[PDB]
Design a binder for this molecule. Structure first.
Ligand SMILES: Nc1ncnc2c1ncn2[C@@H]1O[C@H](COP(=O)(O)OP(=O)(O)OP(O)(O)=S)[C@@H](O)[C@H]1O
Ligand SMILES: Nc1ncnc2c1ncn2[C@@H]1O[C@H](COP(=O)(O)OP(=O)(O)OP(O)(O)=S)[C@@H](O)[C@H]1O
Ligand SMILES: Nc1ncnc2c1ncn2[C@@H]1O[C@H](COP(=O)(O)OP(=O)(O)OP(O)(O)=S)[C@@H](O)[C@H]1O
Ligand SMILES: Nc1ncnc2c1ncn2[C@@H]1O[C@H](COP(=O)(O)OP(=O)(O)OP(O)(O)=S)[C@@H](O)[C@H]1O
Lengths: 415, 621, 209
């Protein structure tokens, strides 16, 4: 009965239908099962970089046990998820922790080898109760005889920072290397996960969304790993779309919020007894008017669309990938096609002459938004030289301003 | 009666036949005996690396006592297994643990030496305090309690040797690991205990392989233990196969029962770009439902006319582990190896002398002919620029792993100063970055099958060469933490750009004057690359156009190219001093620029197909 | 060839008290503090930094050194061996001159005889050819595939790879390139199934099986 108090039940939740579906990864679950059913030292440890799916495999094994796809030895085994945090809760006295540990071990042993314990992030088991090495290695006699099974899973570099420093305990563990999947596999994963999200957020999701997410999340976000940085885009897109099925969409709610601030400023700046703030007001009014025009236009266009956007598509994902890691990944939604066609004449406002070099920079900027340049190569690498005072540094500073509206936003180093 | 509460009975467990047969190790047990049977200070301690068998020796001694092979000074003595953990269980009050331990010690002394206390993991005897594990120090030095302990080699000097007053009362017994010939015998003795638990049979030709094979592939662990896992796993897998269908008939069915649902929920997509994906997935499904039904037929051809493990299940296990493929070329891989300079030729063009040398040290290693202790192949190819010598090392890492970014590349141009060596080997203990290991080292210790690439090697400082000096020719280098990492399965590739135009001995003598003979001598053939003839550019043209086309299929947007343009581009591939890089700029100056201009100016939309045609000088879409 | 800086001496001696890697002790020490009958080998001693040379000062001719923990291990039963490649171009004066220029007098004075190796002669390569062939046969004896080499073959093999500037590794690479390639192409293309004894013989330039 100590188990009932110091651990939860995984297989029970698997029966009650509360674990996400698990797709693919057949070799890994096969190896986990065959290691989990050998004579001595049956303790598989899923190891590998963070995010690639290591708890998902154990959940898949649990659902598989509930279904019946397991061999004979693993029929009705009742996986158990330990918890060493709630075990060291209040034990300030001398034996209060070893007592609980002995109780749990005894109740695991009393069962006829049924229980399959599961310690998630087992790199925390090392220094369980310190004071002088005594605790956390009381299970070391039972690991060897294979009484308790203990399928665990830790990240790849907290296994050689915490455990491999304890070569006597690493010996009792078998490593199952979980490498990350490819884009073709991630698409398949998403195709089966595209229902829980689609039901939690009251929306629908096109298959093009899944494809484009699994591709862009690999092309751009080069700091995480694949089964997760692809689910995040889908999830945020769906949440945003549900937020817009509220009263108003974006790009109308932003303009009205701007208009309100401009109004509350123009109403309280009017009663200013000065002469220099007269011109500092003469522009604020014009701005308020030119913004209210846009508000009214958008509001009228919405009415037309509503009398004459309900699922996420392959471009809302681009909006997310642009809002996070501000690389523009869109599809030229008419806001800036005119701008990129005017680029030369616009960079002419600050630089004069050297059309032979302005056109060369503009072409490299242009053929990258249309999706034609090499996706794994810099967006352009020019070295323009010539005599002094001509304008080379000036063109470089004009380009950064035309792109980000702040010449202090580019990275400059003086070689 | 207090020894019943805090300890089990090893000798009784050995009487009912509950312990594994212990084989060999005569000297260790005889020394344990002749230490355990002296006047004072009669308590040994076994010492040695984890896994080499140190509880096995105590269990062997217990079975030996039960049989009666021991001398008169030990005939009819029981061994009790003390359990320090179950003594501090409830002792929150200020003296209860000391009371318990004192009762235990008094009861041990109350007998006349008919008990031999055996403490396992005795490095845990230092604590128990909060003046504990210290009241034992008097009775130790007099020989009252006969203590048999066994801790690993490096927790000894961490918990015990710190207390030279207590480590004086112990006589050390070193337990070195066995050899291959002895491990074979140990397995020959232990086989019939797994033969029962798993309802299978194990072949002696497999017992020899599970010990010869696990001695050149798994170096992070020690002997027998790293050789019993293979046998046990092979047997468990064979039993799984016996119950259900065999493997490679199970996964083919699992993925087929998934592609079904995929295409079923996909066919309901009111979309147009998703029709090219559905009509491509619907072909792999019918292709898999073909070889599945072929396997079910080829299985009955055997089931009408694989029942014990052999030297093949062991190799399959030690291959699923550690990733290293050591199998038997199961007729699907050999057909692929036989045409390798044909699958490499789809990405590298020309350089027949070099493709038939990289590809030549993979076959002669997969067939079991190469030296088992030296890298799979270590050769440097060098020549002029833009020729294809960093591309070959990527067409090769893609043939073997199906992913160009699963290999280990280090750009040796950042190693300009000699102190930049610590970047790939770690920093010695007591310094800033030490709990991080090396950087090249920790990359191979996790997957010892990658293909390392040292790009632009002559730009570095001539000390990193001397670091590499032992990587070649032995496949070993140890980092700060003192962990030896093996390279005996990687493929070492070093690019360069020396010479730059010299025919053959302006370059062969420029290598000789930048490297030392002891470094040139470890290498395999030094491959020389050659410039690009005008003929072998008309084909790179096709490769480039295919690349761009595949890049364009994100919009279902094709393009038709006429042979005049295709041979115009290749004739404007110029200057046999810059190789094949100018062509990739020519393509984007000609086609890509105006395509992108037309693409965001309306007048070209998705699904279209634009034909190129050679205007009298330029290209027109 | 890795001990190239001052601070990499703490790699074989441990760390001074109170620092990061302290419970780990030394690396040369903790393997000669137990079972002190081993053999110590320093490859390419001249690749180091001439401050590692001054730990071997009290290692040699006194037989003890003290790690970080203060313990004193004793080297009174080991056999130290240092290899190098100094000179490599002079007959007998350049090697000694380079040694005297790269080491200290109180370091060359501690050792026993500083031996010189000669360099293999054309006669001394047949006795290596048969060694290599026996080793290779032992390798491809795990499939009962023992070779059967002809005496003209052995003489050609000991005449092709000889060049007196790279020692005896060219012979190994030649054995591989000549025999192993043909054998591996013949082995996985059927026709050389196990339990076979393939003979090798001399063709004009190559040597066909
Ligand atoms: N094969 C898979 N099938 C279904 N969902 C998967 C699969 N692999 C990963 N996921 C999902 O992707 C996410 C991966 O999270 P987890 O794998 O549980 O985290 P992790 O891989 O254990 O990494 P850590 O170390 O636990 S934070 C979860 O949302 C999973 O539901
Ligand atoms: N074509 C031009 N259009 C506009 N301003 C220009 C032009 N050429 C020069 N200038 C002015 O000249 C200033 C200095 O020119 P820079 O380009 O900064 O000097 P530079 O071209 O970098 O030559 P060096 O070799 O670096 S001194 C700029 O800040 C501009 O104000
Ligand atoms: N001489 C031997 N005869 C038979 N089996 C042996 C022998 N030596 C080891 N084994 C087996 O190999 C394994 C070794 O496990 P143990 O020796 O109990 O662990 P250990 O050697 O004590 O290492 P530590 O320090 O306890 S983690 C067990 O399965 C033993 O049954
Ligand atoms: N023989 C070739 N076959 C196919 N592509 C080639 C060939 N030679 C060069 N390339 C192209 O050239 C680029 C790679 O050239 P690399 O070989 O990597 O340059 P390199 O040979 O390393 O010369 P350096 O000294 O490193 S600049 C890719 O875009 C390849 O497509």
């Amino acid at each position: 009965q100590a188990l009932q108090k110091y651990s939860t039940d995984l297989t029970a939740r698997a029966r009650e239908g509360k674990l996400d579906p698990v797709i693919g990864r057949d070799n890994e679950i096969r190896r986990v099962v065959q290691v989990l059913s050998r004579r001595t030292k049956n303790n598989p440890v899923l190891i590998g970089e963070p995010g690639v799916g290591k708890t998902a495999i154990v959940e898949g094994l649990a659902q598989r046990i509930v279904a019946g796809d397991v061999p004979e030895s693993l029929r009705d085994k009742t996986i158990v998820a330990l918890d060493l945090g709630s075990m060291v809760a209040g034990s300030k006295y001398r034996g209060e922790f070893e007592e609980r540990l002995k109780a749990v071990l005894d109740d695991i042993k009393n069962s006829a080898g049924q229980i399959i314990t599961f310690i998630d992030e087992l790199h925390t088991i090392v220094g369980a109760g310190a004071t002088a090495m005594d605790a956390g290695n009381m299970i070391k006699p039972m690991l060897a005889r294979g009484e308790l099974r203990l399928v665990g899973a830790t990240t790849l570099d907290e296994y050689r920072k915490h455990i491999e420093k304890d070569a006597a305990l690493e010996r009792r563990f078998q490593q199952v290397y979980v490498g990350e999947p490819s884009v073709e596999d991630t698409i398949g994963i998403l195709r089966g996960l595209k229902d829980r999200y689609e039901v939690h957020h009251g929306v629908r999701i096109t298959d093009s969304a899944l494809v484009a997410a699994a591709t862009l999340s690999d092309r751009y976000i080069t700091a995480r790993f694949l089964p997760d940085k692809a689910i995040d885009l889908v999830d945020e897109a769906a949440s945003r779309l549900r937020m817009e099925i509220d009263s108003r969409p974006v790009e109308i709610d932003e303009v009205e919020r701007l208009v309100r601030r401009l109004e509350i400023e123009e109403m309280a700046l009017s009663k200013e007894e000065d002469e220099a703030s007269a011109e500092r007001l003469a522009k604020l009014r014009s701005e308020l008017a030119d913004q209210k025009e846009k508000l009214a236009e958008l509001t009228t266009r919405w009415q037309n669309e509503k009398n004459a956007k309900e699922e996420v598509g392959p471009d809302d994902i681009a909006d997310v990938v642009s809002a996070w890691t501000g690389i523009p990944a869109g599809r030229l939604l008419e806001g800036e096609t005119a701008k990129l066609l005017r680029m030369e004449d616009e960079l002419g406002k600050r630089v004069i002459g050297q059309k032979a070099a302005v056109t060369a920079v503009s072409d490299a900027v242009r053929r990258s938004r249309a999706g034609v340049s090499d996706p794994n190569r810099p967006t352009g690498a020019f070295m323009f030289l010539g005599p002094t005072g001509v304008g080379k540094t000036e063109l470089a500073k004009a380009l950064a301003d035309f792109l980000f509206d702040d010449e202090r936003a580019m990275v400059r180093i003086d070689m | 009666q207090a020894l019943q509460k805090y300890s089990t009975d090893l000798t009784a467990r050995a009487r009912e036949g509950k312990l594994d047969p212990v084989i060999g190790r005569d000297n260790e047990i005889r020394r344990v005996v002749q230490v355990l049977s002296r006047r004072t200070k009669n308590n040994p301690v076994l010492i040695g690396e984890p896994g080499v068998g140190k509880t096995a020796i105590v269990e062997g001694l217990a079975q030996r006592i039960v049989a009666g092979d021991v001398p008169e000074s030990l005939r009819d003595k029981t061994i009790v297994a003390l359990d320090l953990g179950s003594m501090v269980a409830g002792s929150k009050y200020r003296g209860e643990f000391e009371e318990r331990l004192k009762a235990v010690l008094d009861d041990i002394k109350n007998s006349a030496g008919q008990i031999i206390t055996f403490i396992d993991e005795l490095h845990t005897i230092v604590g128990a305090g909060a003046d504990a594990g210290n009241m034992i120090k008097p009775m130790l030095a007099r020989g009252e309690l006969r203590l048999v302990g066994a801790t690993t080699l490096d927790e000894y000097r961490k918990h015990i040797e710190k207390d030279a007053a207590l480590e004086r009362r112990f006589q050390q017994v070193y337990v070195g690991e066995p050899s291959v010939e002895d491990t074979i015998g140990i397995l020959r003795g232990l086989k019939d205990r797994y033969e029962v638990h798993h309802g299978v049979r194990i072949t002696d030709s497999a017992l020899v392989a599970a010990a010869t094979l696990s001695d050149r592939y798994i170096t992070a662990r020690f002997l027998p233990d790293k050789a019993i896992d293979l046998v046990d796993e092979a047997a468990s897998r064979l039993r799984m196969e016996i119950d259900s269908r065999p493997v490679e008939i199970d996964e083919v069915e699992r993925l087929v029962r998934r592609l079904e649902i995929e295409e079923m929920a996909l066919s309901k997509e009111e979309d147009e770009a998703s029709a090219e994906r559905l009509a491509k997935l619907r072909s792999e499904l019918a292709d898999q439902k073909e070889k599945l039904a072929e396997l079910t037929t080829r299985w009955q051809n055997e089931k009408n006319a694989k029942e014990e493990v052999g030297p093949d299940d062991i190799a399959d296990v030690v291959s699923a582990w550690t990733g290293i493929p050591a199998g038997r070329l199961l007729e699907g891989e050999t057909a692929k190896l036989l045409r390798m300079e044909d699958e490499l030729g789809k990405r590298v063009i020309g350089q027949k002398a070099a493709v038939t040398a990289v590809s030549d040290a993979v076959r002669r290693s997969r067939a079991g002919v190469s030296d088992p202790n030296r890298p799979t192949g270590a050769f440097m190819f060098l020549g002029p620029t833009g020729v294809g010598k960093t591309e070959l090392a990527k067409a090769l890492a893609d043939f073997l792993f199906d992913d160009e970014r699963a290999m280990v590349r280090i750009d040796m141009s950042e190693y300009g100063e000699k102190h930049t060596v610590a970047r790939l080997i770690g920093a010695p203990p007591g310094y800033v970055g030490y709990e991080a290991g090396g950087q090249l080292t920790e990359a191979v210790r996790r997957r010892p099958y990658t293909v390392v690439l040292f790009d632009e090697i002559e730009k570095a400082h001539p000390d990193v060469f001397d670091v590499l000096l032992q990587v070649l020719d032995e496949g070993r280098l140890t980092d700060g933490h003192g962990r030896t990492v093996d390279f005996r399965n990687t493929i070492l590739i070093l690019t360069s750009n020396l010479g730059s135009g010299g025919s053959a001995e302006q370059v062969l003598a420029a290598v000789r004057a930048t490297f030392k003979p002891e470094f040139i001598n470890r290498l395999d053939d030094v491959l020389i690359f050659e410039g690009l003839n005008p003929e072998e550019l008309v084909r790179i043209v096709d490769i480039q156009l295919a690349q761009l086309g595949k890049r364009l299929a994100q919009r279902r947007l094709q393009l038709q190219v006429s042979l005049p343009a295709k041979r115009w581009l290749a004739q404007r591939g110029f200057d046999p001093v810059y190789g094949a890089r100018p062509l990739r700029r020519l393509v984007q100056q000609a086609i890509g620029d105006q395509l992108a201009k037309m693409l965001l100016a309306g007048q070209v939309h998705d699904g279209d197909t634009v034909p190129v045609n050679v205007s009298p000088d330029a290209d027109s879409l």
